[PDB]
């Protein structure tokens, strides 16, 4: 069949081989971090191919490969959406992770558990790739919760430090506050649209009501650290600097914004939720920049800069410009 389909699934699959070999002999040696870095680089150069195919013709696919349980008229399956957002974000995230791992082999050299650090970095990358390419709400929730657990484990990397554990539990708390809205959105979409699949949700909602979009907005605010739920992102600087650079800077924290990007056909039909998104983004970017301009910890300054950029992304979503928000990501 078409090559484009095979390449997209191979990238994600070969991202998981070092996790399988985590019980092998190579995990007991000092060559494991280099093995993980090489795997990520190969995945990046392999994922460059579907990007070229899309840039040439614009190839788009849905791959529903495995049928998981069926619930009367509701069918749940392992389905991947390989649209422009996925095929554009995957190479960028892989490139950033490759650079971060190469930096970590120098930064975390004296750490006794450096293989576990790389294993952890790879697990976060896998969960984020699950989040980005999900075609239904259950799979997207799987990625949503996986990135949260990985951030909890990586913030509290030094578990003998009280403040690290406090920060990890803080991140979990705020993300559960957002998860309330995520679960509300899932319940509404199943009860009214009879699906968690994206195609049926788009088809059956020509004029989306307030409640599902407000749940989506609450989830996005929780996971992108908007004004009501902001402090966990600066508090997350307790983890090692590579963790701050990969998760809480450029890949995981944009997830909430990405969610609002993923549902943009429904968002454009509602003026109230658009206005709420715009106002939340504006207050977030202002408040976090205002906090930033007076800080003395350098990592805190960069974290507040990240939060302001996320607020700007929310403003762009609120003015009904999702592709520009993706480009900013």
């Amino acid at each position: 069949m078409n090559p484009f389909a095979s390449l997209t699934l191979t990238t994600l699959t070969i991202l998981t081989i070092p996790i399988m070999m985590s019980n092998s002999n190579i995990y007991k040696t000092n060559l494991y971090p280099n093995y993980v870095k090489t795997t990520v680089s190969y995945a990046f150069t392999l994922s460059l191919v579907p990007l070229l195919m899309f840039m040439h013709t614009g190839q788009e696919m849905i791959i529903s490969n495995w049928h998981w349980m069926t619930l009367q008229t509701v069918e749940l399956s392992l389905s991947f959406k390989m649209d422009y957002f996925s095929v554009m974000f995957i190479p960028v995230a892989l490139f950033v992770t490759w650079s971060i791992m190469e930096f970590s082999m120098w930064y975390m050299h004296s750490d006794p558990f450096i293989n576990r650090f790389f294993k952890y970095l790879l697990l976060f990358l896998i969960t984020m790739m699950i989040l980005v390419t999900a075609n239904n709400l259950f799979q997207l929730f799987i990625g949503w919760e996986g990135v949260g657990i990985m951030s909890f484990l990586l913030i509290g990397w030094w578990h003998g430090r009280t403040d690290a554990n406090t920060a990890a539990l803080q991140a979990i708390l705020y993300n559960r506050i957002g998860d309330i809205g995520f679960v509300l959105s899932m319940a509404w979409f199943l009860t009214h649209s009879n699906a968690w699949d994206l195609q049926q949700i788009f088809m059956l909602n020509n004029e989306c009501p307030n409640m599902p979009l407000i749940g989506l907005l609450l989830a996005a605010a929780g996971k992108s650290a908007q004004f009501g739920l902001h402090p966990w992102l600066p508090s997350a600087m307790e983890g090692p600097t590579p963790v701050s650079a990969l998760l809480h800077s450029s890949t995981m924290v944009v997830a909430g914004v990405f969610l609002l990007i993923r549902f943009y056909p429904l968002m454009e039909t509602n003026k109230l939720v658009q206005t709420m998104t715009l106002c939340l983004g504006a207050i977030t970017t202002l408040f976090t920049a205002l906090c930033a301009i007076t800080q003395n910890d350098i990592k805190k300054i960069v974290a507040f800069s990240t939060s302001s950029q996320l607020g700007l992304m929310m403003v762009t979503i609120g003015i009904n410009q999702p592709h520009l928000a993706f480009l900013h990501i």
């Binding site: 619930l71 009367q72 509701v74 009860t191 009879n194």
Partner: protein
């Protein structure tokens, strides 16, 4: 040992039915139940009246 015992097993022998204790117990243990009952009963009465009137628009509502 004293801390855990005081927190767990010494409470009831030192309990005394007092106006403060009685009012706080009644409030915190009954008021939320009746508040939530009123809220849910009102919500479901409105939904039932709407569905009898036919103006609910339950299209595509297959799973319950």
């Amino acid at each position: 040992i004293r801390w855990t015992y005081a927190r767990s097993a010494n409470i009831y022998p030192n309990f005394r039915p007092t106006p403060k204790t009685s009012l706080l117990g009644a409030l915190f243990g009954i008021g939320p139940l009746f508040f939530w009952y009123y809220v849910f009963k009102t919500d479901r009465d409105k939904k039932e009246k709407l569905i009898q009137e036919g103006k609910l628009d339950q299209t595509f509502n297959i799973s319950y």
